[PDB]
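User: My advisor, Dr. K., asked me to get a structural model of this assembly before our group meeting. I'm new to this, so sorry if the format is off. These are the inputs:
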Amino acid sequence: AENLWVTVYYGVPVWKEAKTTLFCASDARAYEKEVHNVWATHACVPTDPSPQELVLGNVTENFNMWKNDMVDQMHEDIISLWDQSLKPCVKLTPLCVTLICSNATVKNGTVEEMKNCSFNTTTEIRDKEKKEYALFYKPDIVPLSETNNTSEYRLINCNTSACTQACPKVTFEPIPIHYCAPAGYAILKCNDETFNGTGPCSNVSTVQCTHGIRPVVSTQLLLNGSLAEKEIVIRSENLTNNAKIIIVHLHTPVEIVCTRPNNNTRKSVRIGPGQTFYATGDIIGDIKQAHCNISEEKWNDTLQKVGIELQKHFPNKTIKYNQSAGGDMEITTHSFNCGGEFFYCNTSNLFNGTYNGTYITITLQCRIKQIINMWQGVGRCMYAPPIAGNITCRSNITGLLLTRDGGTNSNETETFRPAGGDMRDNWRSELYKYKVVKIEPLGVAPTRCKRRVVGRRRRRR
Amino acid sequence: QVQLVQSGGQMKKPGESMRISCRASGYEFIDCTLNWIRLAPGKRPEWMGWLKPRGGAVNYARPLQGRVTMTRDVYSDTAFLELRSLTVDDTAVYFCTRGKNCDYNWDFEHWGRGTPVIVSS
Amino acid sequence: EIVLTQSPGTLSLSPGETAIISCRTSQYGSLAWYQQRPGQAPRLVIYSGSTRAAGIPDRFSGSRWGPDYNLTISNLESGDFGVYYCQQYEFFGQGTKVQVD
Amino acid sequence: AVGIGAVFLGFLGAAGSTMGAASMTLTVQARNLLSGIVKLTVWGIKQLQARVLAVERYLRDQQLLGIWGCSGKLICCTNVPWNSSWSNRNLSEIWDNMTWLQWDKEISNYTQIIYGLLEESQNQQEKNEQDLLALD
Amino acid sequence: AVGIGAVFLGFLGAAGSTMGAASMTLTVQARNLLSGIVKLTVWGIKQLQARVLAVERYLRDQQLLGIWGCSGKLICCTNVPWNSSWSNRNLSEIWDNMTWLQWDKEISNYTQIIYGLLEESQNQQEKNEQDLLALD
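Assistant: The format is fine. Below is the predicted structure of the whole assembly, which you can bring to the meeting.
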């Protein structure tokens, strides 16, 4: 032992658990485009060339992605960012009129998807109205009840809630958005590539800001994500619990190509003094219907690789995939946005067949909607205006969302189906490496010092 | 005050389908999973698929996956169970339940009244 | 092979004495117990193994012996008689009937 | 680490280094806690929500040093004897082993008690701030 | 009251007690002035309106100590002779009776004048910060 006395050290490098609101920072000069974006702020300006990193030797910190405080911070702020940009745009109350709809004829043909609907709309002056028409490019317009007439329809907003247009100025883009903790707080990061979602991580490093996380929104398949480093990784709270969501990470992607080969034309309807309504007016080309293309071999390899990885947790059980069970159109079909159009793809063959994992062009028909109830379920009704001309997409699938059927299956089999519907599980697949810890210079630490004598200064000790 | 109002007792023949309701009240929004359970007398309890009323995702459980279908109605705070092709063995009490809290639903603390369904040949 | 087995099938008791029900399990998972008198919705008694449910009397207790679990009920009054069900993650036991003499 | 210009992400690796060696380059944290990286929308209000708390946390730490008599000093001795009940009187053999991140769990319960004693050290000065010597 | 552990509502009984007894436990006020007990609505904006002024007032007080040479010291002597016009030169006998709440009424008009002298006192030192001695 030794004679020891109290000492004060503050400026010390130790932290504690905490949660706080986090500043956003966008990559490169995208903040200059970000002013005209939604899913992006107005704007996330960086002050220094982020990100920067330092590896901390001998540091082990406990991580958990399912109780993560950042995912609630983003989802509760993206949806708040979403309806702010939509707030000043035109509302579609005056369109709820008794629509008279008939077959949508096109050059030497007819289109099965959509209906040619006409309605009386108010002119600039309120006491006069004019006939107007537009091709609502979905058959999802409810027929009007309390009548034997089959040719009277109605826009599905007004049964439950009036909707707002998405103004042409703002653009739907998954711009990469970094999050930077404020001063006094530090963001840790787990470099352990074998991290399964919870437990100790022994390769911790600190960063100024998170990596370029982009706020993509989709269901049943994660698009344009960050791939796993070494191999396929499967992450769930508790695999034995048939509830929860089995987020999968692919270490190499499969390119999904999607398109809207029709050549549509935008039409401006004058519903009010300044308020303008945009609708698809006519088709000026041959009709070929939307679809998507995915490689047969490359995707088939993905299920074989994923199947054996699942079988590690479920020993000696053959892994079967199968079609989605049920729900709204938002989760029973692979939904996503691309180029201003909201696709809902059937997954014609991204479900099928036994895949044991022991080794012993797929075309998806896709529907399109203009009115969307936002993915969180009961949110704002938004009318996405039409986009003229063809649309084409090319994206990297990086992770699959799955859920399992139980309990009394045959003991040698197990059935897996897609999932979705909660946006937090999309972003929890990318925002899982991080923590936020408040830096607390601590209490005292004893030293061999001695009581200061009559206010005198002192060098070493 | 979260409680589940359920209705109602009924008789059926073999073969025909059946529909039961369950309303959740005293509860700000139906955001958490909602199960359905068959308490058949003289047999172990049997379980039927949960329902996540937010997105409507559903997970039909036992060999009933070819028969049961489940929906909901967010604006009325109601969930429905529908069973097709009623055999003679499907006589039991059908309970609309919910977990203790939304983080872990397998501790069913809140139950409905119980809707007895009888099938008579 | 995921099965929960309750034993014995039924207990005959004079009201005011002790009684025990078991629930053997073949998988790793949480446990809970339910009580059903005829003509009512079953109650929740204990959950997460041994912890008691809210508002339930203190007569009930349980112990996690390992892959075997046991429930012990002390000085059972007439009102607490019924049928007892085990539960894990869906999977329910065959039910044990607690009956008066 | 030896060298104090460095960066805040140049020294914090001392979080796993020896508790003795981590006492060097102690100024970089004191620099970093001030400002760091930081129409109306979400980020605009966040620059007032987070910024003001970052300032107030800094003031709370500094005024404790001011009251204790450690104003402006990173290291600072204090006239308080170390009670062996808080920890064994042999840390001189141990701060070469423990890191600062590990020392904290020794005194988690005792930290708020100890701050009273550091204040009590100051009343040995506050008692000796009215009586005799200031005629000099 | 004498003691420093205390509570902010543990010492303020000195508001009536003598200035001598009030001169001890002078630190508890310095602790309380920092933070104290503090969709968007009225209280949310009030937490930004009141909080920033609480910080602002604290800086203005420490601003004056940092200039007068009393930085970090609760008590502090200054090189200014007390002019008898401000008050009689027998307060050393009197402040066993008056409380600080009563003393302030006497120097109410003269407080802003006195701060000039304390500033001048530092600038007897600042005038002596260029000429001779500190070749070392």
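One thing worth pointing out at the meeting: Chains B and E do not touch (no CB pair under 8 Å).

User: Perfect, thanks a lot.
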